[PDB]
Structure formats: structure tokens, C-alpha cells
Design a binder for this molecule. Structure first.
Ligand SMILES: *[C@@H]1O[C@H](CO)[C@@H](O[C@@H]2O[C@H](CO)[C@@H](O)[C@H](O)[C@H]2NC(C)=O)[C@H](O)[C@H]1NC(C)=O
Ligand SMILES: *[C@@H]1O[C@H](CO)[C@@H](O[C@@H]2O[C@H](CO)[C@@H](O)[C@H](O)[C@H]2NC(C)=O)[C@H](O)[C@H]1NC(C)=O
Ligand SMILES: *[C@@H]1O[C@H](CO)[C@@H](O[C@@H]2O[C@H](CO)[C@@H](O)[C@H](O)[C@H]2NC(C)=O)[C@H](O)[C@H]1NC(C)=O
Ligand SMILES: *[C@@H]1O[C@H](CO)[C@@H](O[C@@H]2O[C@H](CO)[C@@H](O)[C@H](O)[C@H]2NC(C)=O)[C@H](O)[C@H]1NC(C)=O
Ligand SMILES: *[C@@H]1O[C@H](CO)[C@@H](O[C@@H]2O[C@H](CO)[C@@H](O)[C@H](O)[C@H]2NC(C)=O)[C@H](O)[C@H]1NC(C)=O
Ligand code: NAG
Ligand code: NAG
Ligand code: NAG
Ligand code: NAG
Ligand code: NAG
Lengths: 235, 99, 244, 49, 49
């Protein structure tokens, strides 16, 4: 970077210190702060196994093995746990899982088309996920397919309707038993009436939700005492 | 933005996988019609299903079969105008740009 | 039979197969109760509502032990051991920290209430259109061609049982768009011409039932020179045996 | 407070994108996988495909 | 002392990030089988190229 000889500092878009000259060699050197990943943990559930796989979210793991450091979490796990089972993804790199060329359904989503699972001397495998069974429809200029049989299917669909109605008292939540706190809360105005109005509007709205879903009839209809509907069992 | 604690995570489905999904949906709706979304895919020729879609809007199917070449030419010229119009006027994709 | 005419199958198909359709429906309902019993991860949508409301309330009550930079989280410890004119900045910073804690409870309650309102409006639409009628919209009331639906109440929600029609066992046939009989093109009135291989039939589109091609069964439009894939056969015209 | 006021607008915009994605899933089920009778749902005119 | 204020922000952003992948999977993954077009592209004069 040409650095305009009186200038000493360099900034990026977000005004953070980017390129510094050498003060006596007079050469331009970048600043890239070495930092910053996230550890993500792949587990199959602790009832089934206790072995894990570890994703580092944004790195080359030619440069994994150095450090975790906060209080006493430490390099001493890491110095030979780099080893083998190192696989580089586009979502970071993954340690403790072995890549295969098979393509399965997604079980635990790593990201960027990679999923992981636990099977087969059991182990964690990582694979490229498959979209479905391959199929080719026999298209022709004069050929049609007509069904000769059928199937009655019953499926279920779950939908939420309402949630829990909650209301608040401000003075008991914030102050409680002391009167001087209520006198200081009095100087802060009417935030509490606004919060009570908001929660009251939510609690009215939940009963309105249940009444629009379920009360679509005006009369209560009864089934007959006999239950014969041509062979259909509704019990 | 990376160096201040903020991460962009990649999506689970890549663009090739989404393109394979839309290719499967296109090949299903050309070779089978509406039948692949309600069960197994049953094949039908394309002017016969276009006759079915004219019966869906209240026009008898001989209007298709006696005008098949004209309807095919109108459809092909309409697709070509879609590509030429979408190549120009650079504010048609403002909804995806705003995100 | 009315609901089979709603999906394009003629109503004889029910009455000639009534015992089989009743057996398939009863076995389907029994598999609903067995499959929904013996899985753990169903009804997660109703469980997440209870978990989110409880977790937000436990967050709000666990933020009463946060000092917000004050020397204590107990108000009487502020009022003991410290004179009342310069205890004001600590207690006022406590009031603010508890008050924006209550404000950020209420704002996510409003956002979650809007999400539940969108779900409840969808459930009211599904009860009007799937339960109280028969729907033509694809995959709105289940996979397949929709016959009916039944509601069941659940804690904080609703469960719909969608009864649908699925075609099962298909066959290949040769087909043609029209039939040229006497120099006139015949088009099917409400079916499709299929060939077995030697003789041509007309059938309905969603169930295999072949019929003899008659003049009552087809309609005539134009002459056999303009349609591309037209073939030659005979059209029966049921008046010739009834002439004498 | 800067982080909290970032996360609140992210939640509001995520609700807006979810309403748009539910509409796109309905249009893919009803206009692509079938033929629609609803007026002006899948274009202007009588819908073919 | 503000230990329990960043956990809800991390939970909220994680819920948004799961929800986006759910949005894409409800729109696009509506079929279970990957159908293929035939090797010869003749559809009665309609040209889908
Ligand atoms: C349509 O499918 C049903 C599937 O249940 C067939 O019914 C079965 O038929 C076999 C012999 O044909 C019996 O052994 C089974 O007990 C039947 N199952 C039931 C539930 O009844 C039916 O035969 C098929 N129809 C045709 C014309 O093939
Ligand atoms: C409707 O179907 C149910 C299927 O469970 C029938 O209930 C069974 O009936 C037999 C004798 O009728 C009992 O031995 C079983 O224990 C019952 N099962 C259950 C789960 O209760 C019921 O009888 C049928 N209804 C009619 C009118 O036939
Ligand atoms: C295609 O289907 C037709 C159905 O009509 C078959 O025609 C029948 O064949 C049997 C003996 O093969 C005759 O007894 C019937 O009189 C025929 N019916 C008519 C209306 O002609 C035909 O054989 C089938 N083709 C093949 C190759 O199996
Ligand atoms: C269907 O039948 C018609 C009967 O008219 C056939 O048309 C005749 O075809 C021969 C030679 O193929 C010509 O010499 C005649 O002049 C045609 N007649 C007319 C009125 O055009 C026709 O070929 C038959 N189609 C098939 C596929 O065999
Ligand atoms: C289908 O339509 C496309 C329209 O683009 C045709 O592609 C053009 O073909 C001509 C000659 O056939 C070329 O000069 C053009 O450059 C092509 N355009 C492009 C964009 O490639 C294509 O030929 C048509 N297919 C058939 C079978 O007719
Ligand atoms: C500076 O300007 C010169 C001449 O225009 C040219 O080399 C280049 O565009 C700029 N950057 C550097 C690094 O030289
Ligand atoms: C990661 O490592 C590969 C292998 O040397 C290299 O090509 C690539 O540029 C590296 N990327 C980063 C961001 O360090
Ligand atoms: C399996 O995957 C590895 C690495 O991706 C590759 O080197 C190997 O050739 C693959 N095996 C086969 C049979 O393709
Ligand atoms: C079907 O396609 C083939 C190949 O394009 C063609 O030769 C044949 O004539 C077509 N059949 C009809 C009935 O048009
Ligand atoms: C129809 O025929 C094609 C080839 O002739 C075959 O691949 C296909 O499986 C057949 N369909 C059925 C349902 O038998």
C-alpha cells in the first residue's frame, strides 16, 4: 500500500487499524489480528455414546493446534489431539469425524452441504448429504400411465393456537416492600402503565385466537345413539 | 466485521443443491404434470396435458389441438421476451437486493 | 360419493368398493393412534410454546439477582450502611436495570404473540376450508386429493386429521388426442383415449375404467386434417341396432 | 444496548422474511404443482402453469 | 455480573439461523425423488431451453 509519507496509520472501512509502516525500515505491513473462532460440538446424545466431534467454524486447520485460553482451559488437550481425522470443510474444519464417499440423509447438519452421523466399532462419520432417490420418468410422445387402484391416507397436522396469559405488577417486581423505592419509581413516569397495557392486549388476544379457531358453529350438534355409518368406525 | 466478534454462517443447502431441486421440479412438471405432487408420477404427452389445462379454464380442448403451432410460437416468443426484458431495466430484482 | 365426485372420480367407484374403502379407513385411523403414540418427537410445536414461555419467565426471575453495577442487589442493604442522599445513584441504576429487563420481557412477548396470531389465523382458515368443506388447493389439507378432515383439540392447539386419496397401481397405455372416424375428428367428452394394444377405449383420468367409444361418449369438432397425432378407429353410434 | 437493539430488528425482519417464505411455499404448492383457480394469485389472466 | 444477558442474545440469533434453513427447506424440498428430463428434448414444439 502506498502510504503518503507523513501518514503513520491505516484504517479499513470500519475505522479499525489496518496497515502500519515500519518506523525505521519504512515498509508497509498489514495488521491481521489472529483470533476468533467458535467451537461447535457434535454429539450423538449421551445415552448412546460419549464420543464427540469438534467443528472450528472459520479456519484453516493448518493453524488449529495452538490455544484455548480463558482461565485454565489450555493447550494440553491439543498438542497431539490434532493428529488424524482432520477434514477441511467450507464451514470450517472438523476434527474427530471421518469422511466417506457415500451419500445419506441428513442427520446432524454441519453446513455447506455436509452432514454428520454416528454408525458402524462405532464412529462419527461425515458425508455429503443426498437429496433423494434418483428417478427418470419414461416420457414418450404417445404413452400415458393410468392408475388401477388407490389408497386412503390419513395424516396429521399440528398447529399452535394460543399461549400463556401473563400479567405483571411493577412495584412488587421492581421494589417490593420498601416505600422509598416506590417514591423513586413514581418519578420515572408511566412506563409501567404502558407495559401493563401491552400485556393486557396480549392476554385479550389469546382468548380471541381460541374463539376464532373453535367457535365456528352456533349450535351444538349431537351424534345419534346408534353408531353405524356404513362400516366406517369413528370411535 | 469479522474482527469485531461477528460471524456469517454458511447455509446448509448449497446453490447446486437448490438448482437440483428446481431441476427436479421442472422435470416433474414437464413429464408428468400435476400428478407427481399428489402421488406417483404418471407420464402424459405435453400437448395432452396442455389440453387438460385448457379444460381447467373453461375452453374446450380442440381449441388447443387446432391451434397448437401458434400457441407454441407464442409461448417461445414470450420466454425470449422474458430473458431480454429481465436482462435490461436494472430494478426488477430490488426485493432480493434489499435483503 | 359426493366427495369422490369432488376429485374427479365417478361415484360408482365408491359403491362398488365400499367395504374395502371402509377397511382402509379404519386401519388408517388405528395406525394414526399407534404411530403418534410410539414416537417421542411428535407434538414438538406445542411443546416449544410451553418451553419458551417458561424459559422467558425463569430468565425474568433470575435477573433479580443482578447488581447492575450496584454494590448489592438488596434494597435494604442500600438503605442500611449508606446515607440516603448519595444512595440515590445506586438505587436509580437498580430501577433502570430491572425496568429495561421488564421492557425486554414485554417486547419479545409481543413478537411471539404476533407469531402465534399468524399460526392461529392459519388454523382458523384450515378449519373453515378443510373441515367445513372440501378443498381444491394443492397440499393445503394434506398430501393427495383431499376428501375430508377431522379436528381434535390439544393443549394450546389443534390437530387436524386429513383424509386424502392416493393413486396406487399404474399401467402403461398408448394414447391419441383424437379419433378420425368418418372424416370427422372425435374428442373425448370427459376422459382420455387409451389403447390396450389392439382396441381403443375411453377412460376417466384418475381410475382405470374402459368404455366403448360411442357418439354419446365423444364430441365432434372439425375434420381429421389439422390434428397432429390423430388415429383411425370406429365410433359406435348406438341407434343402428335400435332402428327396427 | 447496541447489541440488543441489533437483535430486535433482526427478529422483526426475520418475521417478515418468514411471511414471505410461507407465501412462496404456498405458491410453489399451488401454482407449480397444480393449477389454480384463485384470481390474480399466479399472474394476470386465467392461469395455465 | 451481566452473565445472563448475552445468553438470550445468543439464543435469539441461533433461533433465527435455524429458521432460515427451515425456510429454504420448506420452499424447495417439496419432492422426494429427483426426476430427470429425457435425453431428447421434443415436447410438441414447446422449447424449454
Ligand atoms: C387394490 O389394493 C388393495 C390393497 O389393500 C387390494 O386388496 C387386497 O387384495 C388381496 C388379494 O387381491 C388380499 O389378499 C388383501 O387382503 C386385500 N387387502 C385388503 C385390505 O382388502 C385390492 O385387491 C386391489 N384391487 C385390485 C383390483 O387389484
Ligand atoms: C371400532 O374399532 C375399534 C378398534 O379398536 C373396536 O374396538 C375393539 O373392539 C373389540 C371387540 O369389539 C375389543 O376386543 C377391543 O379391545 C376393542 N379395542 C379397543 C382399543 O377398545 C370397536 O369395537 C369398533 N366399533 C364397532 C362398532 O365395531
Ligand atoms: C386389449 O384389451 C382388449 C379389451 O377389450 C382385449 O380384447 C378382448 O380380447 C378377448 C380375448 O383376447 C376377447 O374375448 C374379447 O372379445 C376382446 N374384447 C373386445 C372388445 O374386442 C384385447 O385382447 C387386449 N389386447 C391384448 C394384446 O391383450
Ligand atoms: C386413416 O384412414 C384414412 C381413410 O381416408 C386414410 O387416408 C387415405 O390414405 C391413403 C394412403 O394412405 C390415400 O391414398 C387416401 O387418399 C387417403 N384418404 C383420404 C380421404 O385422405 C389414412 O391414411 C389412414 N391413416 C393411417 C395412419 O393409416
Ligand atoms: C430452442 O430455442 C433456442 C432459443 O435461444 C434456440 O437456440 C438458438 O438456436 C439458433 C439456431 O438454432 C442459434 O442461432 C441461436 O444462437 C440459439 N440461441 C441461443 C441462446 O443459444 C434453440 O435452437 C431451440 N431449439 C430447437 C430444438 O429448436
Ligand atoms: C496509485 O496511483 C498510481 C497511478 O495512478 C497507480 O500505480 C495505482 O492506480 C495506485 N496505487 C498504487 C499502489 O500504486
Ligand atoms: C487455507 O489453506 C489453503 C491451503 O494452503 C490455502 O490455499 C488457502 O488460501 C487458506 N485460506 C485461508 C483463509 O487462510
Ligand atoms: C473417497 O473419498 C476420498 C476423499 O474425498 C477420495 O480420495 C477417494 O478416492 C474416495 N473413494 C472413491 C472410491 O471414490
Ligand atoms: C415422438 O418423438 C420422436 C422423436 O422426436 C418422433 O420421431 C416421433 O415422430 C414422435 N411421435 C409422434 C406421434 O409425434
Ligand atoms: C412403462 O414403460 C416403460 C418402458 O416401456 C417402463 O420403463 C415403465 O416402467 C413402464 N411403466 C409401468 C408402470 O410399467
Amino acid at each position: 500500500k502506498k502510504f503518503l509519507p507523513f501518514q503513520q496509520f491505516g484504517r479499513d472501512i470500519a475505522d479499525t487499524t489496518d496497515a502500519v509502516r515500519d518506523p525505521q525500515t519504512l515498509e508497509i505491513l498489514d495488521i491481521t489480528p489472529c483470533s476468533f473462532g467458535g467451537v461447535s460440538v457434535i454429539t450423538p446424545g449421551t445415552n448412546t455414546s460419549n464420543q464427540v466431534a469438534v467443528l472450528y467454524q472459520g479456519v484453516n486447520c493448518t493453524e488449529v493446534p495452538v490455544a484455548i485460553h480463558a482461565d485454565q482451559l489450555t493447550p494440553t488437550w491439543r498438542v497431539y489431539s490434532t493428529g488424524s481425522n482432520v477434514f477441511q470443510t467450507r464451514a470450517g474444519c472438523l476434527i474427530g469425524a471421518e469422511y466417506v464417499n457415500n451419500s445419506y440423509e441428513c442427520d446432524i447438519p454441519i453446513g455447506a452441504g455436509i452432514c454428520a452421523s454416528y454408525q458402524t466399532s462405532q464412529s462419527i462419520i461425515a458425508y455429503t448429504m443426498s437429496l433423494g432417490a434418483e428417478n427418470s420418468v419414461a416420457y414418450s410422445n404417445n404413452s400415458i400411465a393410468i392408475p388401477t387402484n388407490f389408497t386412503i391416507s390419513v395424516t396429521t397436522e399440528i398447529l399452535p393456537v394460543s399461549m400463556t396469559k401473563t400479567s405483571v405488577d411493577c412495584t412488587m417486581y421492581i421494589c417490593g416492600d420498601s416505600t422509598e423505592c416506590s417514591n423513586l419509581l413514581l418519578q420515572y413516569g408511566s412506563f409501567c402503565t404502558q407495559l401493563k397495557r401491552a400485556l393486557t392486549g396480549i392476554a385479550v388476544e389469546q382468548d380471541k385466537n381460541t374463539q376464532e379457531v373453535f367457535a365456528q358453529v352456533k349450535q351444538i350438534y349431537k351424534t345419534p345413539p346408534i353408531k353405524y355409518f356404513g362400516g366406517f368406525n369413528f370411535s | 466485521q469479522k474482527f469485531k466478534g461477528l460471524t456469517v454462517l454458511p447455509p446448509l443447502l448449497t446453490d447446486e443443491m437448490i438448482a437440483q431441486y428446481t431441476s427436479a421440479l421442472l422435470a416433474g412438471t414437464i413429464t408428468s404434470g400435476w400428478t407427481f405432487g399428489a402421488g406417483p408420477a404418471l407420464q402424459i404427452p405435453f400437448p395432452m396435458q396442455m389440453a387438460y389445462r385448457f379444460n381447467g379454464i373453461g375452453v374446450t380442448q380442440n381449441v388447443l389441438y387446432e391451434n397448437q403451432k401458434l400457441i407454441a410460437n407464442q409461448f417461445n416468443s414470450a420466454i425470449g421476451k422474458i430473458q431480454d426484458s429481465l436482462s435490461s431495466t436494472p430494478s426488477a430484482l430490488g426485493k432480493l437486493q434489499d435483503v | 360419493a359426493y366427495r369422490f365426485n369432488g376429485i374427479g372420480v365417478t361415484q360408482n367407484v365408491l359403491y362398488e368398493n365400499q367395504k374395502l374403502i371402509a377397511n382402509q379407513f379404519n386401519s388408517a385411523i388405528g395406525k394414526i393412534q399407534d404411530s403418534l403414540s410410539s414416537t417421542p418427537s411428535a407434538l414438538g410445536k406445542l411443546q416449544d410454546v410451553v418451553n419458551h414461555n417458561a424459559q422467558a419467565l425463569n430468565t425474568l426471575v433470575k435477573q433479580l439477582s443482578s447488581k447492575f453495577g450496584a454494590i448489592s442487589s438488596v434494597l435494604n442493604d442500600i438503605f442500611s450502611r449508606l446515607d440516603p442522599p448519595e444512595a440515590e445513584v445506586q438505587i436509580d441504576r437498580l430501577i433502570t436495570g430491572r425496568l429495561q429487563s421488564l421492557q425486554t420481557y414485554v417486547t419479545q412477548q409481543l413478537i411471539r404473540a404476533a407469531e402465534i396470531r399468524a399460526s392461529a389465523n392459519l388454523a382458523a382458515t384450515k378449519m373453515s376450508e378443510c373441515v367445513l368443506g372440501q378443498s381444491k388447493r394443492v397440499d393445503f389439507c394434506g398430501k393427495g386429493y383431499h376428501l375430508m378432515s377431522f379436528p381434535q383439540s390439544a393443549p394450546h392447539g389443534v390437530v387436524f386429521l386429513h383424509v386424502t386419496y392416493v393413486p396406487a397401481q399404474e399401467k402403461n397405455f398408448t394414447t391419441a388426442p383424437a379419433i378420425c372416424h368418418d372424416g370427422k375428428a372425435h374428442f373425448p367428452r370427459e376422459g382420455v383415449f387409451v389403447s390396450n394394444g389392439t382396441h381403443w377405449f375411453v377412460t376417466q383420468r384418475n381410475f382405470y375404467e374402459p368404455q366403448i367409444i360411442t357418439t354419446d361418449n365423444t364430441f365432434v369438432s372439425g375434420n381429421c386434417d389439422v390434428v397432429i397425432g390423430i388415429v383411425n378407429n370406429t365410433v359406435y353410434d348406438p341407434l343402428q341396432p335400435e332402428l327396427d
